UniProtKB/Swiss-Prot annotation, chain A:
Protein name (record): Eukaryotic translation initiation factor 1A
GO cellular component annotations of the record: cytoplasm; cytoplasmic stress granule; eukaryotic 43S preinitiation complex; eukaryotic 48S preinitiation complex
Domain S1-like: 8-81
The species this protein was found in: Saccharomyces cerevisiae (strain ATCC 204508 / S288c) (Baker's yeast)
Other facts: Present with 35100 molecules/cell in log phase SD medium.
Domain of life: Eukaryota
Molecular function GO labels: double-stranded RNA binding; protein kinase binding; ribosomal small subunit binding; translation initiation factor activity; translation initiation factor binding
Keywords: Initiation factor, Protein biosynthesis
Similarity comment text for this entry: Belongs to the eIF-1A family.
Functional note: Seems to be required for maximal rate of protein biosynthesis. Enhances ribosome dissociation into subunits and stabilizes the binding of the initiator Met-tRNA(I) to 40 S ribosomal subunits.
GO biological process, one term: formation of translation preinitiation complex
UniProtKB/Swiss-Prot annotation, chain B:
Protein name: Small ribosomal subunit protein eS31
Top-level taxon of the source organism: Eukaryota
Originating species: Kluyveromyces lactis (strain ATCC 8585 / CBS 2359 / DSM 70799 / NBRC 1267 / NRRL Y-1140 / WM37)
Positions of C4-type zinc fingers: 45-66
Biological role: Component of the 40S subunit of the ribosome.
Summary of subunit composition and partner proteins: Part of the 40S ribosomal subunit.
RNA sequence: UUCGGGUCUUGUAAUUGGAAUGAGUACAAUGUAAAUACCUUAACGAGGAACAACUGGAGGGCAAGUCUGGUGCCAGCAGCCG
């Protein structure tokens, strides 16, 4: 079904109100919940341009933007596919308390 | 089907080799003998012809009308 | 007065022989090329004019018209473009005819008067 | 990158739009004078005859 | 014979005049128990007549843009379809 579709990138760093987070489990209705690297478990919504275009699963470091009025929830934006996640761990912008390897 | 990284340079700079705006090179070239005869300075070009002044660098006087032809010791 | 200097400048422009500026004038007059040489009185430090006088004697005749600004203004320097003089500033300050172009009326008369009397 | 800033800034396009100044626009004759203008515009100075009115057309 | 007189009219112009007048002031008088206000009226009171008309809307429903620039399934709009 690729004929119906629209048919080596680089990482993007967090910028003043967004954070890298690790998904802990995938929730229904299209939602998800992720630990932000602050000691907090936030509730992320899979944003548009993202829903059924690029997938994500458990144990995947992924960028999420916060909403300034209600910190308890947030919306996920940009995914990182398992190789620039190591780079993210390397550059040290986020604490390395969470290593994810298989 | 590709996004290009910026061409970052590990090279300081290379600028256009600007020509030197020489102010009145002809007084340097000539020498007037008190309202009469006038002499030229430092050589005349035999390979190019009369009137073309030559180049002073050292142990060699140099052309530049037909540049590669004449650079000889004197 | 000087209605033929414009004319001879234009005729030499027809044959592209104006030693414009000064360096071309010097190199041409050291050769047997320059016919008429004009150096102006309005030259600062008068060293260039002094050297021109010393050389041209040696291609001997000259005309000593002053005020080079208007000279190069109508000596064929720049472009008229619209009706007249479409340029900020322009001048020559020394001119030399290497090639005559045309003739008729005033070529060698006032040169005979000025240079050979 | 993925997004220039924080999404849902609550007034993003208003905050970032290029705010163009208003114009001078000489006074329109308002009232029955507006009916002057408009009636002369449509029904006595007939402007487009082929097909429909196409009034207020896109200049192109 | 192409014309072109615009010959007859209509419009369009930051061109250009002189008319007319109220909203506002205000002599007064009337009006009223006293008064305000109105109805009259001296004298004032229009040039950009800045003495300035807003409120919604221009995909359909439904009259009106496939104009410009901005955002880029975000912000938002949308009674419904979107
Ligand atoms: Mg295809
Ligand atoms: Mg979402
Ligand atoms: Mg008004
Ligand atoms: Mg609207
Ligand atoms: Mg409106
Ligand atoms: Mg309509
Ligand atoms: Zn030589």
């Amino acid at each position: 079904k690729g004929r119906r579709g629209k048919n080596k990138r680089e990482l993007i760093y967090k910028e003043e109100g967004q954070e890298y987070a690790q998904i802990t489990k995938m929730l229904g209705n299209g939602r998800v919940e992720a630990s932000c690297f602050d000691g907090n478990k936030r509730m992320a919504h899979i944003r548009g341009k993202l829903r059924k275009k690029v997938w994500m699963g458990q144990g995947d470091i992924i960028l999420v933007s916060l909403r300034d009025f209600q910190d308890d929830q947030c919306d996920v934006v940009h995914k990182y596919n398992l190789d620039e996640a190591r780079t993210l761990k390397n550059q040290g912008e986020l604490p390395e308390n969470a290593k994810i390897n298989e | 089907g590709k996004k290009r990284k910026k061409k970052v340079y590990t090279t300081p700079k290379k600028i256009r080799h600007k020509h030197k705006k020489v102010k009145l090179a002809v007084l340097n070239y000539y020498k007037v003998d008190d309202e009469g005869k006038v002499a030229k300075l430092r050589k005349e070009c035999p390979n190019c012809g009369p009137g073309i002044f030559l180049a002073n660098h050292g142990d060699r006087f140099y052309c530049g009308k037909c540049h590669s032809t004449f650079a000889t010791q004197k | 007065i000087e209605d033929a200097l414009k004319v001879v400048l234009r005729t030499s422009l027809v044959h592209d022989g104006l030693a414009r500026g000064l360096r071309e004038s010097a190199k041409a007059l050291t050769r047997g090329e320059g016919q008429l040489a004009v150096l102006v009185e309005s030259v600062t430090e008068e060293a260039i004019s002094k050297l021109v006088q010393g050389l041209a004697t040696e291609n001997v005749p000259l005309i000593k018209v002053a005020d080079a600004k208007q000279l190069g203004e109508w000596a064929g320097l720049g472009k008229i473009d619209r009706d007249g003089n479409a340029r900020k500033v322009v001048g020559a300050s020394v001119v030399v005819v290497k090639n005559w172009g045309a003739d008729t009326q005033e070529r060698e008369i006032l040169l005979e008067h000025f240079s050979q009397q | 990158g993925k997004v220039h800033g924080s999404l849902a800034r609550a007034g993003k396009v208003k905050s970032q739009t290029p705010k163009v100044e208003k114009q001078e626009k000489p006074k329109q004759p308002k009232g029955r004078a507006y009916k002057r203008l408009l009636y002369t515009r449509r029904f006595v100075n007939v402007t487009l005859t082929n097909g429909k009115r196409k009034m207020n057309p896109s200049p192109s």
